[PDB]
Amino acid sequence: LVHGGPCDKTSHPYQAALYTSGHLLCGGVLIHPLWVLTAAHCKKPNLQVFLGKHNLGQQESSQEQSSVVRAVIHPDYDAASHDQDIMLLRLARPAKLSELIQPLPLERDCSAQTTSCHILGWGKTADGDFPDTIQCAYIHLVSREECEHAYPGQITQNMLCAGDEKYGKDSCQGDSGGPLVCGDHLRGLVSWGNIPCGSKEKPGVYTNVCRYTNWIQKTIQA
Ligand SMILES: CCOc1cccc(C(=O)Nc2ccc(C(=N)N)cc2)c1O
């Protein structure tokens, strides 16, 4: 995450850290004790999910680790365009809830009125390094028309755009699959955007979570 700052220790109980080969790969969102939502392009071998983490460089009393027993990629995910960039991970060990481990409810209304939004993650910062402490930033949803102008022919109905006019606060590599939170609800998942990261003109592109209500519920209940 670029141009942000360290999160408040108690503000992100839904945040998951996804690892492969002992290295951080992606972000994720806890949505049920047994399920974590992430981006479909985060599919890698033997994913290890860490909940209750704030600082990746230290062992924390609140942390809970679990392997993945099932990875469910949306049937219509298109890797080249990032269309339908969503995947459900079933935990081997269900999340033991605490003040620092809680699910985040989903935004089910695609026409939800404008609320305060924020992004978070252990992705690439402004200096180009990967931080040990989770970063946070307030951003705003960008109109579909302005986003279409930024990325001609690339924005689908399964995508949302958000960014920051002032400093270009934006998500980056490592934050993928992490949450775009609007009014204490999951509005989006970090998917793609400007390289190098920065949203002053080209906003961050997020999976439009409201579109996947039926698919998520059908997968969890299957
Ligand atoms: C499975 C690991 O995932 C990745 C691997 C390689 C590259 C990326 C990446 O560049 N992602 C990204 C770019 C821009 C924005 C943005 N500016 N909003 C967000 C994410 C990646 O996620």
Q: Give DSSP secondary structure letters for 207-219.
A: EEGGGGHHHHHHH
Whether 111 sits among the annotated catalytic residues: the reply is no
- The experimental method behind these coordinates is X-ray
- Secondary structure letter of residue 37 according to DSSP: E
| The pair of three-digit structure tokens given for residue 82, joined into one six-digit string | 């990032």
What is the whole-number distance in angstroms between the Cα of residue 58 and the centre of ligand 1? Answer: 25
CA distance 211 to 191: 15
CA dihedral for 35, 86, 79, 73, sign (positive or negative): positive
Within the chain, all domains assigned CATH 2.40.10.10 are found at 13-103+211-222
CA distance 152 to 133: 35
Listed residue (142, 196, 188, 212) closest to 27, CA to CA: 188
CA distance 132 to 130: 7
Whether 176 sits among the annotated catalytic residues: the reply is yes
18 and 25 Cβ atoms separated by less than 8 Å: yes
111 and 187 Cβ atoms separated by less than 8 Å: no
Listed residue (108, 116, 150, 134) closest to 11, CA to CA: 134
28 and 101 Cβ atoms separated by less than 8 Å: no
The residues facing 80 across adjacent strands are none
CA distance 92 to 96: 12
What is the whole-number distance in angstroms between the Cα of residue 26 and the centre of ligand 1? Answer: 9
What is the phi/psi pair of residue 106, to 5°?
-85, 150
CB of 142 within 6 A of ligand 1: the answer is: no
CATH no., domain 13-103+211-222: 2.40.10.10
| The pair of three-digit structure tokens given for residue 50, joined into one six-digit string | 């860490």
